[PDB]
Amino acid sequence: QDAKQIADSLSIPPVKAGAKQLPMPSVSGAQIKLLGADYEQLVNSKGKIAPVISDTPVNVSFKVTKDGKEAVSKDYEIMLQAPQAAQGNPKPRIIPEILQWKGGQGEYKLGNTVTIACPDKELGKLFAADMEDVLGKKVKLVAPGAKADISLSLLKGGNLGREGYRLQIARDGVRLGAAAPTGLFWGTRTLLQMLRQTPGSVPCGTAVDFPRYQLRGFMLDVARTPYPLSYLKDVIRTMAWYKMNDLHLVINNNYIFHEHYVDNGHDPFKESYAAFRLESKMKGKDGTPLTARDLFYTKKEFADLVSYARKYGVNIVPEFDTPGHALSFTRLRPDLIYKGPMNHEKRRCEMLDAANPETIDLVSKVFDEYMLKDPKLGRPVFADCGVVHVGADEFYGDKEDYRHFANAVLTHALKRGYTPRIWGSLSAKPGKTPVVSKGVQMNLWSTGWMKAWEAVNQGYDVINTNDGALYIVPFAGYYRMDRNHKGLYNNWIPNRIGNETLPSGHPQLLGGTFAVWNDETDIMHTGYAPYDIWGIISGSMDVLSQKLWGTAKAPDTFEQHRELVSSIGNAPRTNPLHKWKDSQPLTVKPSSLPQKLDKPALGPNYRLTMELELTAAPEGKEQVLLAAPEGELLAVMKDGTVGFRRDDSLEFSFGAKLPVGKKVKVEIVGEPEKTSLLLDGEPAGTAVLKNFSDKSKDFSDKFKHRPKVHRSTFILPLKELGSSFQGKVFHMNVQPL
Ligand SMILES: [Mg+2]
């Protein structure tokens, strides 16, 4: 006698071949429903099966009812069989993998010019410029429905859904069809990756392709250390390139290790690093603003960032951390700092009193500034954000008080017309105060704080965000997922969340998100840059994008997957390393200053050579020698030294000064994480982050956490020469190495 053991012994009837309905397993004393498939587009809740052009695996699971209990089943892989009417060309290797492919006859060679018909004006313009970048040929947009080489068209009906697409290649041209304009955009990514491998020709055949999961995401901690907008748009295009579509951005956070200031005689509430990256009218009675003072986003900048990411299929999800990680808020309202008992009293200043109604009032006001209409924009700043993340990971006080606050902030978003996302913490914070679940998204980041199984039964849509598997803390001893890309690529599946496993077809499973946390910042900051973590961010993407969009099994080895990542290269019109196209040098003998150069910024490795003479060095006045949006090369700083400021706002000093009134030969050597200075051939010093060096001065010993490496990556600015340089520049040379 089985007793909802039935579920792990079920017998799926044959499924015949090319059937229309999923046959159902029957067991005498039990009632058995269909929970769902991993490809809802192939086997729906109603059990109806869609045709396939190539044999595709689908994982179904069930609810077995017998006596008064249930349990959801294990996954059953059925494989929908296609009619093998033909066979032809092999499937093109794409990241992520194409689900279905029917090989065809021959090739479609491209002409000296390419024409494209597209009913989406903004999509068609995007597509054509990505085309010219990859091909080098020049691409024409034709009327939507005129005679063209590649024709994008919106198909009605079908199973594709908002992210599917039918890509068809014949030797008379290419025809991309989708149900929504968003799946048409993913079709371009597939076509562009092929054209990356064979720019002259694409094999004939039909490609039908679906994402297995709805939410394929990357969170970025843009609060503990700054990230310029230009970098975040490199991230949007690189995610779109691997068909990832969820950019979760932490807008406010603060330095974790407030103890470092306490144990050394300082006030963390007064010196710990905190940030709120969005522009805000909010200011405290003491005039202190909520918006971060070193780098922030204006409301229009952010509103435009969200619309840009939507053009490339990515939904930006902004997060406001409360009541924890809220040192930016408590600095406005010290009277709301939680005062109750707690387990690590040295980290109090970052905690809002979630029990105080005058705290929910404040958090609501901050939210409303972006959820309600903005006067200047004529619409909310978060107008294009369907999902807003309300934070709510932890509260040091009563568990019931946490639940009341969690329910307040989740419902605030629901009543303002927004879907909320929350860090799963209800297992850690159980209680009788009801917390809303229907309409609410939850990040399953830790199993001790929220069990995946009890999250789905309480009624949440869940996102695999598991810390042991998907957290990256750059250059840290713990949370180094960037050294496990091989294991992720081979074993990681979205429905296994820590040591729990959901069925891949559970409808409340949205997908998964990997996370980048910048813990070792402030008085621990090594000086690393958004450039310095690009390789692991982009490399985390190219692995997880396969396991999020594709089937449960990697189509190749990790080693083959990485040499395909190389053939396909960066995303169209995306140069995150500022590599130059030709390694010939740039030579300038300036006529007078400032000289305008108008060359692209140059990343490592490079060497800068200049013959110059400093005519004056008034004290306290900065002297910009090289300038571009990526940063400034400071001939003289406020302390008199040579150094530079990056576009992430971190400043660095070489510790050397230029002689006033002397001809000097200046060389600067740019390497990954090392920028070196040589004056007259002699080593003048190596760059050191100056941003948070104070405060930690007088800490003396017992600051075992001072940064032990000094990283100073510097993308060379090359737009204007000698902006505010009080001197002459005789000769200047830039050389990629
Ligand atoms: Mg564009």
Side-chain angles (χ1 to χ4, degrees):
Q1 180 204 296
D2 299 291
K4 280 80 68 171
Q5 288 169 344
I6 293 161
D8 300 344
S9 77
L10 278 178
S11 66
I12 299 298
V15 79
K16 290 178 73 173
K20 302 264 154 214
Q21 192 79 12
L22 179 78
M24 206 75 169
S26 75
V27 161
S28 296
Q31 316 184 4
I32 305 150
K33 190 190 288 183
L34 177 70
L35 180 80
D38 54 339
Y39 285 110
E40 175 78 55
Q41 309 107 313
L42 286 185
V43 171
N44 63 339
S45 46
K46 290 180 282 291
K48 193 170 55 54
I49 287 150
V52 300
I53 58 179
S54 83
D55 296 349
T56 311
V58 174
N59 293 287
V60 299
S61 50
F62 307 85
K63 287 181 182 173
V64 182
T65 305
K66 182 180 181 179
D67 300 339
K69 298 180 186 297
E70 54 168 347
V72 315
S73 69
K74 61 172 192 200
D75 280 332
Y76 292 78
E77 173 197 313
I78 57 171
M79 190 168 288
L80 312 181
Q81 296 176 286
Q84 188 85 64
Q87 69 89 41
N89 282 305
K91 185 165 93 190
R93 298 185 73 210
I94 303 300
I95 300 162
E97 206 204 341
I98 292 177
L99 188 44
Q100 316 178 28
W101 169 263
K102 194 201 292 162
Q105 46 80 29
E107 301 285 310
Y108 166 67
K109 191 174 181 66
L110 284 82
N112 303 136
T113 59
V114 175
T115 74
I116 308 194
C118 194
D120 205 299
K121 176 80 65 152
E122 208 73 14
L123 172 63
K125 297 175 74 175
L126 188 157
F127 186 28
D130 284 18
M131 286 293 292
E132 301 203 357
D133 203 54
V134 167
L135 290 197
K137 303 175 183 185
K138 300 305 190 285
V139 180
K140 303 173 54 194
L141 292 175
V142 305
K147 177 66 179 176
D149 304 8
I150 313 171
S151 306
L152 286 71
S153 84
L154 280 185
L155 318 183
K156 304 307 186 169
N159 61 3
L160 306 182
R162 301 186 78 82
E163 297 206 281
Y165 65 99
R166 185 142 188 143
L167 189 73
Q168 319 201 59
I169 297 89
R171 50 169 66 98
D172 65 337
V174 176
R175 305 180 301 180
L176 170 65
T182 309
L184 282 179
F185 174 77
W186 301 133
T188 66
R189 302 311 98 166
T190 302
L191 197 72
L192 282 164
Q193 287 196 359
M194 284 159 73
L195 287 186
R196 263 301 174 81
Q197 311 175 67
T198 68
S201 43
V202 290
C204 298
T206 301
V208 183
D209 197 43
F210 315 143
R212 196 161 70 118
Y213 286 103
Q214 327 184 355
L215 194 148
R216 310 180 294 287
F218 161 52
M219 181 190 77
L220 183 55
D221 177 358
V222 296
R224 291 201 180 104
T225 186
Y227 288 82
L229 282 159
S230 62
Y231 190 72
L232 297 191
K233 288 171 58 171
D234 278 346
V235 183
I236 290 158
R237 298 188 288 261
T238 311
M239 281 161 82
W241 186 235
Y242 303 121
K243 300 182 182 66
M244 290 185 76
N245 60 0
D246 202 76
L247 186 46
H248 173 163
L249 292 170
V250 182
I251 298 307
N252 66 297
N253 221 324
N254 67 24
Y255 185 61
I256 296 173
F257 310 97
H258 302 295
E259 51 265 34
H260 295 177
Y261 291 105
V262 173
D263 301 335
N264 277 263
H266 286 239
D267 199 343
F269 171 78
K270 192 166 156 171
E271 317 209 314
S272 278
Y273 186 90
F276 190 89
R277 298 307 177 180
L278 280 178
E279 170 197 37
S280 174
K281 60 169 145 74
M282 184 67 83
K283 282 192 197 163
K285 279 187 155 225
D286 44 11
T288 43
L290 168 75
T291 287
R293 212 76 146 159
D294 56 2
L295 194 151
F296 69 87
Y297 312 124
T298 73
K299 276 158 193 171
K300 192 199 161 210
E301 278 174 344
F302 195 83
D304 287 343
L305 179 72
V306 182
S307 296
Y308 185 78
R310 293 249 290 161
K311 203 205 290 183
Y312 291 78
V314 180
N315 301 308
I316 289 191
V317 177
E319 190 188 338
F320 287 169
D321 276 341
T322 55
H325 313 296
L327 189 57
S328 293
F329 297 96
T330 61
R331 275 179 186 180
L332 308 160
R333 291 296 305 282
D335 60 290
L336 299 179
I337 295 179
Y338 176 72
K339 303 294 198 202
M342 65 172 288
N343 313 123
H344 308 285
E345 271 168 4
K346 301 193 206 157
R347 316 173 150 177
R348 167 170 278 162
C349 53
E350 81 174 12
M351 177 69 37
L352 285 163
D353 195 357
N356 192 343
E358 187 170 359
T359 289
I360 179 62
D361 290 356
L362 174 77
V363 168
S364 276
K365 188 160 164 221
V366 174
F367 270 116
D368 275 342
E369 193 177 346
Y370 307 86
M371 296 199 295
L372 290 185
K373 285 180 181 183
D374 191 77
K376 311 217 154 274
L377 293 158
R379 69 185 309 204
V381 185
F382 290 177
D384 305 303
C385 295
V387 173
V388 183
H389 202 294
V390 303
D393 59 13
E394 169 61 284
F395 174 49
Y396 297 157
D398 184 341
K399 310 195 164 25
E400 297 290 351
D401 283 346
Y402 167 85
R403 300 180 63 92
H404 184 248
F405 178 99
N407 188 71
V409 74
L410 289 172
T411 49
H412 190 139
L414 286 174
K415 75 182 79 171
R416 291 287 190 259
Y418 295 86
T419 289
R421 189 173 305 170
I422 195 175
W423 298 107
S425 293
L426 292 196
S427 290
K429 305 300 179 103
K432 199 85 183 153
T433 308
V435 187
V436 58
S437 63
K438 196 140 199 174
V440 183
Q441 284 177 6
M442 200 182 250
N443 286 121
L444 296 188
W445 67 288
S446 159
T447 306
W449 294 74
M450 188 81 229
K451 284 142 193 163
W453 273 110
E454 171 73 331
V456 292
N457 310 326
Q458 278 193 32
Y460 294 87
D461 289 340
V462 295
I463 309 165
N464 190 350
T465 318
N466 187 272
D467 64 326
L470 301 156
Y471 278 8
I472 294 178
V473 186
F475 311 124
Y478 55 95
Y479 281 141
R480 293 302 296 264
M481 173 260 283
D482 52 305
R483 305 153 146 180
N484 196 42
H485 284 152
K486 194 201 192 176
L488 285 183
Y489 187 71
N490 285 340
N491 304 296
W492 185 86
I493 56 184
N495 50 314
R496 199 161 47 224
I497 311 166
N499 66 16
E500 323 182 64
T501 308
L502 308 158
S504 60
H506 197 301
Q508 302 188 214
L509 179 58
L510 299 184
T513 308
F514 82 94
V516 169
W517 301 101
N518 291 292
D519 296 21
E520 300 194 2
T521 48
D522 194 9
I523 52 175
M524 281 185 271
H525 206 295
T526 51
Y528 73 95
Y531 169 102
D532 294 329
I533 69 175
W534 175 258
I536 58 184
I537 285 176
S538 69
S540 306
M541 297 186 195
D542 68 50
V543 163
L544 290 166
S545 74
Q546 175 63 43
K547 310 311 295 293
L548 281 161
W549 171 291
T551 55
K553 316 180 144 207
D556 42 9
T557 75
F558 164 85
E559 279 91 11
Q560 310 172 115
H561 164 81
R562 275 305 170 80
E563 64 183 60
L564 181 65
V565 169
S566 286
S567 306
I568 297 170
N570 299 324
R573 308 188 279 143
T574 308
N575 189 16
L577 298 195
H578 300 283
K579 298 311 275 160
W580 276 11
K581 279 75 71 173
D582 178 10
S583 48
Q584 308 314 123
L586 172 60
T587 309
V588 182
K589 280 259 199 197
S591 302
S592 56
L593 290 184
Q595 173 78 356
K596 295 184 179 66
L597 314 176
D598 298 316
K599 293 296 191 70
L602 177 63
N605 303 50
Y606 64 81
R607 163 153 42 221
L608 171 65
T609 309
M610 301 194 39
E611 302 276 353
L612 63 90
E613 157 188 81
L614 188 54
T615 284
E619 170 178 10
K621 166 142 197 191
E622 199 166 272
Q623 297 209 27
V624 173
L625 189 72
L626 280 178
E630 294 80 357
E632 298 168 296
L633 176 59
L634 304 176
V636 189
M637 287 163 106
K638 286 184 201 138
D639 58 18
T641 53
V642 178
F644 54 85
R645 182 184 300 100
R646 309 196 302 210
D647 72 347
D648 71 347
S649 75
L650 297 191
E651 294 180 4
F652 298 74
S653 184
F654 288 119
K657 301 191 199 59
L658 295 174
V660 170
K662 189 188 288 184
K663 277 73 181 174
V664 62
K665 192 215 190 189
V666 177
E667 304 153 67
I668 301 170
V669 182
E671 295 164 285
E673 290 155 36
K674 183 158 164 133
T675 306
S676 300
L677 172 61
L678 295 84
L679 302 192
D680 285 316
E682 293 283 83
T686 308
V688 169
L689 176 61
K690 293 290 284 178
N691 283 105
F692 316 66
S693 51
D694 294 62
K695 304 170 320 175
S696 59
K697 192 276 177 186
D698 74 349
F699 275 17
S700 303
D701 284 350
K702 292 295 212 307
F703 202 42
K704 67 188 85 73
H705 318 288
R706 54 150 180 261
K708 271 144 153 194
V709 189
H710 282 185
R711 303 174 156 103
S712 45
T713 306
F714 183 51
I715 308 307
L716 192 69
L718 294 166
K719 192 175 171 68
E720 179 192 271
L721 169 72
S723 301
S724 56
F725 177 67
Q726 273 162 87
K728 318 190 178 124
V729 170
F730 313 102
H731 165 91
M732 162 188 161
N733 188 79
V734 185
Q735 172 77 67
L737 303 177

